């Protein structure tokens, strides 16, 4: 019943830029803080990025700040990463994620996006 679905990841070159989005659905939107998870191909997930129900309070990974901006449009349901200034260390697969702390199962997550930020040259 809860569905998450991520759009706008790809292939980049350094310097460059992508916006993520996530729709969902199958709860109550603004009830949940939401955030965006990153996992590079030989390390566990971490949470890159963070934002509150309202959309009034924000967190980034140090790794990010100042390059990257989260929000939400609690009125279409949908979350955003704006990725700027891309790295190749910011390579990885991006999940949406809903942070639900009272639920005891683990959060749900987007099927995922790749960003591969990369020069053939």
């Known amino acids: 019943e809860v569905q998450l679905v991520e759009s706008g990841g790809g292939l980049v070159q350094p310097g460059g830029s992508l916006r993520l989005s996530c729709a969902a659905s199958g709860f109550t939107f603004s009830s949940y803080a939401m955030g965006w998870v990153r996992q590079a191909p030989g390390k566990g997930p971490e949470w890159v990025s963070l934002?509150?129900?309202?959309?009034?309070?924000?967190w980034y990974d140090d790794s990010v700040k100042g390059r990257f901006t989260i929000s939400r449009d609690n009125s279409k349901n949908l979350l955003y990463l704006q990725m700027n200034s891309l790295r190749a260390e910011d390579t990885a697969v991006y999940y949406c994620?809903?942070?639900?702390?009272?639920?005891?199962?683990?959060?749900?997550w987007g099927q995922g996006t790749l960003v591969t930020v990369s020069s053939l040259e």
């Open positions: 994620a809903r942070h639900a702390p009272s639920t005891e199962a683990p959060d749900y």
């Open positions: 934002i509150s129900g309202s959309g009034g309070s924000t």
